[PDB]
Amino acid sequence: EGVLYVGSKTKEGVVHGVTTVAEKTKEQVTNVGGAVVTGVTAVAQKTVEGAGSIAAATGFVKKDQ
Amino acid sequence: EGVLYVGSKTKEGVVHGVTTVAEKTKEQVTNVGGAVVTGVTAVAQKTVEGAGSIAAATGFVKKDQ
Amino acid sequence: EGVLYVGSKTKEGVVHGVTTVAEKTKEQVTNVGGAVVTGVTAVAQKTVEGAGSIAAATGFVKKDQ
Amino acid sequence: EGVLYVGSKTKEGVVHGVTTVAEKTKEQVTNVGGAVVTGVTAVAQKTVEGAGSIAAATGFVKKDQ
Amino acid sequence: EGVLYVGSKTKEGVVHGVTTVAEKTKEQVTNVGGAVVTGVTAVAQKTVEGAGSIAAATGFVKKDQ
Amino acid sequence: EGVLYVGSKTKEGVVHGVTTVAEKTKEQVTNVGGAVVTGVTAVAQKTVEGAGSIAAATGFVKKDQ
Amino acid sequence: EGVLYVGSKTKEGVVHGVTTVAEKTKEQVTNVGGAVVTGVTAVAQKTVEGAGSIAAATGFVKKDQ
Amino acid sequence: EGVLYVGSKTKEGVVHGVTTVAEKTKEQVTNVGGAVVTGVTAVAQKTVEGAGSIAAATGFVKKDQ
Amino acid sequence: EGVLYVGSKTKEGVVHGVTTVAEKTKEQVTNVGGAVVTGVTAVAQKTVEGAGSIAAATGFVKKDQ
Amino acid sequence: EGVLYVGSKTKEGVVHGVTTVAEKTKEQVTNVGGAVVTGVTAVAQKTVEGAGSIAAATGFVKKDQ
Amino acid sequence: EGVLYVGSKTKEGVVHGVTTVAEKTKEQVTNVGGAVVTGVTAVAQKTVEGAGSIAAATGFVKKDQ
Amino acid sequence: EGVLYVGSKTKEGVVHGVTTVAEKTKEQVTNVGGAVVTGVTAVAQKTVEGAGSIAAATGFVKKDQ
Amino acid sequence: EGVLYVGSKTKEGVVHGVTTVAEKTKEQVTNVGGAVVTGVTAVAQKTVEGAGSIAAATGFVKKDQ
Amino acid sequence: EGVLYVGSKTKEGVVHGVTTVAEKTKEQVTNVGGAVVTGVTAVAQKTVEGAGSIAAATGFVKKDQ
């Protein structure tokens, strides 16, 4: 149950979403957990129903080693 | 149950979604967990129903080693 | 149950989705978990029904080694 | 149950979402837990229903080692 | 139950969301727990229903070592 | 139950959200617990219902070592 | 139950949210517990209902070591 | 009038003279004015006799334009 | 009139003369005015006799433009 | 009139002469006026006889423009 | 008239002459006026005879402009 | 008229002559007026005979502009 | 007329001559007027004969402008 | 007329000559008028004969402007 309205009157638009530049790096991590929605009129919905939901988002893990 | 409305009146648009530039790097990771929706009118929905949902998103893992 | 409406009046559009440039790198990973929907009018839906859903997205894994 | 209204009259827009520049670094992590919604009219909704929800977001983990 | 109204009459806009520049660093972490919503008209909602919700957000962890 | 109204008549705007510049550092952490909403008209709502909610946000942790 | 009204007539605006510059530092932590809402018209609401809510925000922790 | 003696007892030799690697460049110039003599026993003589000698060596020249 | 003696007892030698690596540059100039003599036993003589000798060596020149 | 003696008893040698690495530069100039003599036993002589000798060595010149 | 003696008993040698690394620079000039003699036993002589000798060495010149 | 004696008994040597590292600079000039002699046994002589000798060495010059 | 004696019994040597590191600078000038002689046994002679000798060494000059 | 004796019995040596580090500076000048002689056994002679010798050494000059 719900209603979402978007209206965009744009004459000129320049959009960037997730950008990453790595030079001479080691172990660069760009990590996104949900959707990546990008645009002059970007809309995103998400409905997680159900008890006990988990939404993890880790860059990295190092164990023992 | 729901309603989603998008209306976009654009005269000129330039959109980029996920961009990645790696030069001379080691172990660069661009990681997205959901959808990558990109456009002058980008719309994304997702409905996860059911108890106990898991949505993991890891860049990387190193074990023992 | 639901309704999704998109309307896009565009005179000129230039869209890019997932772009990746790797020069002289080692182990570059661009990882997307869902769909990659791209266009002047990009729309994406996803309905995961059923208890216990899993949606994993890993860049990489290194074990023992 | 709810209603969300957005109206944007823009003549010129330049938007960036998540940007990351790593030069000569080691273990750079850009970590986002939810969606990355970006645009001249960026809208994002999320409804997590169900007792016991977890939403973790870690940069990295190092164990034993 | 609720109502959210946004109206933006912009003639020119330049927006940046999360930006990160790391040069010659070690273990730089940019960590966001929720969504990253960015745009000339950026709107974000989130409704976490259910007793016992957890929303953790850690930069990093080092254990034993 | 509630009502939120925003109206912005802007002729020119330049907005930055979370910015981070790390040069020659070690273990720099920029950590945000909620959403990062940024734009000429930035609006953010969040409704956490349910007894016993936890919202932790740590820069980092070092244990044993 | 409530009503929130914002109206902003701005001719020119330049806004910055959370900015951090670390040069030659060790263990710099910028830690925010809630949302980071930034813009020419920045609005943020949060309603935590439920007895026993916890909202922790630590820069860092060092134990044993 | 003169005497030049060279004696080389080498068991293993690896010699390079003038080496040039240009990638993605514009107007790279490697310019040598005299001889390029290269070898495990490289010897070079030059005797310019006569008043008013000129020995020019230019990388490049741009005029008017 | 003169005498030059060289004697080299080498068991292993690795010599490089003039090396140049240009990546993504514009107007790189490596300019040498005399001879380039290179080797495990590199010898070079030059005798310029005559009043008014000139020995110019320019990287580049830009005029008018 | 003169005498020059060189004697080199080397078991292992690694020599580099003029090395230049230019990345993403503009107008890099490596300029040498005399000879470039390089080797495990590098010897160089030069005798400029004659009144009024000139030995110029310029990186670059920009005029008018 | 003169005598020059060199004797070198080396078991292991690693020599570099003129080295230059330019990254992202503009108008870098490495300028040497005489010879560049480099090696495990590097010897260089120069005899400029004649009244009124000139030995100029300029990095660069900018005129008018 | 003169005598020069050098004797070097070296078991291990690592020599560097003129080194220059320029990153993100503008108008860096490394300027040497004489010879650059480099090696485990580096010897350099120079005899300028003749009244009125000039030996100039300038980094750079800017005129008018 | 003269005599110069050098004797060096070295078991291990690491020598650097002129080193320069410029980061993010403008108009850095390293200027040497004489020879740059560098090595485990570095020897340099220079004999300027003739009345009225000039030996100038300037970093830079700015005129008019 | 003269005699110079050097004898060096070194078991381990680490020598640096002229070193310069400029970060974020403007108009840094390292200026040396004579030779730069550097090594485990560094020797330098210079004999300027002739009435009216000049030996200037300026960092920089700014005129008119």
Which of E4, E16, E65 is the closest to F4 by Cβ?
Answer: E4
Q: How far is L52 from chain K (nearest CA, A)?
A: 5
d(CA M58, CA K60): 12
Q: Please indicate whether, in this complex, the C-beta atoms of L15 and N41 are within 8 angstroms of each other.
A: no
Six token digits for residue I39? 């080797």
Q: Distance from first CA to last CA of chain H, Å, rounded? A: 50
Cβ-contact J48, L48 below 8 angstroms = no
Cβ-contact C1, C8 below 8 angstroms = no
Question: M41-64 burial, b for 16+ CB within 10 Å, e for fewer?
Answer: bbbbbbbbbbebbbbbbbbbbbee
Give the Cα-Cα-Cα angle A11, A14, A17 (nearest 5 degrees).
Answer: 140
Cβ-contact K27, L62 below 8 angstroms = no
Which of B7, B12, B19 is the closest to C7 by Cβ?
Answer: B7
Q: Please indicate whether, in this complex, the C-beta atoms of E8 and G41 are within 8 angstroms of each other.
A: yes
Count CA within 13 A, CB hemisphere, residue C4: 15
Nearest to I56 by CA among J31, J17, H17: J31
Q: How many CB atoms lie within 10 A of CB I4?
A: 23
Q: Please indicate whether, in this complex, the C-beta atoms of K15 and M39 are within 8 angstroms of each other.
A: yes
Nearest to J25 by CA among N25, I22, L30: I22
Which of A43, A48, A57 is the closest to B6 by Cβ?
Answer: A43
Cβ-contact B53, C56 below 8 angstroms = no
Mutate to test the interface with A, among B1, B21, B49, B58 (most CBs of A within 10 A): B58
Listed in sequence order, the residues at least 6 apart from I53 whose beta carbon sits closer than 8 Å to its beta carbon are H48, H51, H52, H53, H54, H55, J48, J50, J52, J53, J54
Q: Please indicate whether, in this complex, the C-beta atoms of H8 and J41 are within 8 angstroms of each other.
A: yes
Pairing of strands B3-10, A3-10: parallel
Contacting residues of A for B56, CB less than 8 Å apart:
54, 56-58
Interface of B with D in 31-60 (CB under 8 A): 34, 42, 51, 59
Q: How far is J57 from chain I (nearest CA, A)?
A: 5
d(CA C43, CA C61): 32
Cβ-contact J49, I49 below 8 angstroms = yes
Among all chains, which residue has been given the structure tokens 């320019």? I58
How long is chain G?
Answer: 65
N–C touching, 3+ CB–CB pairs within 8 Å: no
User: What is the side-by-side strand order in the sheet with L36-38?
Assistant: H36-38, I36-38, J36-38, K36-38, L36-38, M36-38, N36-38
d(CA G1, CA G49): 13
Could you tell me which residues of C are annotated as the binding site for Cu cation? 16
Mutate to test the interface with K, among L3, L11, L40 (most CBs of K within 10 A): L40
Residue type, J14: V
Q: Please indicate whether, in this complex, the C-beta atoms of I39 and H41 are within 8 angstroms of each other.
A: yes
Tell me the resolution in Å: 2.7
Six token digits for residue C22? 């790797």
d(CA E15, CA D64): 42
Q: Please indicate whether, in this complex, the C-beta atoms of G34 and F34 are within 8 angstroms of each other.
A: yes
Nearest to J22 by CA among L27, K23, M21: K23
Q: Please indicate whether, in this complex, the C-beta atoms of K41 and L40 are within 8 angstroms of each other.
A: yes
Q: Please indicate whether, in this complex, the C-beta atoms of A8 and E35 are within 8 angstroms of each other.
A: no
Q: Please indicate whether, in this complex, the C-beta atoms of J59 and L35 are within 8 angstroms of each other.
A: no
Pairing of strands J36-38, D13-23: unpaired
User: What is the side-by-side strand order in the sheet with J47-49?
Assistant: H47-49, I47-49, J47-49, K47-49, L47-49, M47-49, N47-49
d(CA B40, CA B16): 10
d(CA M61, CA A27): 46
Which of A1, A24, A25 is the closest to D1 by Cβ?
Answer: A1
How long is chain L?
Answer: 65
Q: Please indicate whether, in this complex, the C-beta atoms of D57 and A33 are within 8 angstroms of each other.
A: yes
J65 burial type by CB count under 10 A (0-12 exposed, 13-18 middle, 19+ buried): middle
Write the DSSP assignment of I6-41 as a string of letters: EEEEES-EEEEEEEEEEES-BS-EEEESS-EEESTT
Closest D-chain CA to B55: D55
Contacting residues of A for D8, CB less than 8 Å apart:
7-10
Contacting residues of A for B29, CB less than 8 Å apart:
28-31, 60
Report in angstroms the alpha-carbon separations of N33 from B21, B51, C42, E39.
47, 80, 69, 59
Q: How many CB atoms lie within 10 A of CB M1?
A: 8
Report in angstroms the alpha-carbon separations of E41 from D16, L44, N63.
13, 71, 54
Closest N-chain CA to L49: N49
C–A touching, 3+ CB–CB pairs within 8 Å: yes
A–F touching, 3+ CB–CB pairs within 8 Å: no
Cβ-contact F65, G35 below 8 angstroms = no
Six token digits for residue M22? 């410029």
Among all chains, which residue has been given the structure tokens 């993403």? J24
Q: Please indicate whether, in this complex, the C-beta atoms of D15 and F41 are within 8 angstroms of each other.
A: no
Is the CA virtual torsion F26, F31, F36, F40 positive or negative?
Answer: negative
State CA F45 to chain mean position distance: 12
Cβ-contact E54, E22 below 8 angstroms = no
Write the DSSP assignment of K3-55 as a string of letters: EEEEEEEES-EEEEEEEEEEES-BS-EEEESS-EEESTT-EE--EEESTT-EE
- DSSP secondary structure code for residue B59 in this structure: E
Mutate to test the interface with D, among B1, B5, B8 (most CBs of D within 10 A): B8
Cβ-contact C22, B26 below 8 angstroms = no
Which of D25, D32, D60 is the closest to E36 by Cβ?
Answer: D32
D65 burial type by CB count under 10 A (0-12 exposed, 13-18 middle, 19+ buried): middle
Q: Is H59 left (phi over 0), alpha (psi -120 to 50) or beta?
A: alpha
Mutate to test the interface with M, among L45, L63, L64 (most CBs of M within 10 A): L45
**Bridge partners for N44 per DSSP:** M44
- State which approach was used to obtain the coordinates: cryo-EM
Contacting residues of B for A31, CB less than 8 Å apart:
29, 31, 57-59
Cβ-contact I56, K55 below 8 angstroms = no
Closest B-chain CA to A3: B3
F–H touching, 3+ CB–CB pairs within 8 Å: no
d(CA N36, CA N17): 7
Mutate to test the interface with H, among I21, I41, I62 (most CBs of H within 10 A): I41
Which of B42, B51, B59 is the closest to D39 by Cβ?
Answer: B42
Nearest to I41 by CA among H15, L8, K4, H36: H15
Interface of G with E in 1-20 (CB under 8 A): none
Six token digits for residue N35? 């030779």
Which of J29, J35, J39 is the closest to H59 by Cβ?
Answer: J29
Give the Cα-Cα-Cα angle H42, H45, H51 (nearest 5 degrees).
Answer: 160
Contacting residues of K for I15, CB less than 8 Å apart:
39
d(CA M62, CA K65): 13
Q: How far is F14 from chain E (nearest CA, A)?
A: 5
d(CA N57, CA B42): 66
Among all chains, which residue has been given the structure tokens 């999704």? C4
Element holding J5 (H helix, E strand): strand J3-10
K16 annotated as ligand-binding: yes
D–E touching, 3+ CB–CB pairs within 8 Å: yes
Q: How far is G19 from chain E (nearest CA, A)?
A: 9
Mutate to test the interface with E, among A3, A5, A11, A15 (most CBs of E within 10 A): A15
d(CA M18, CA I2): 33
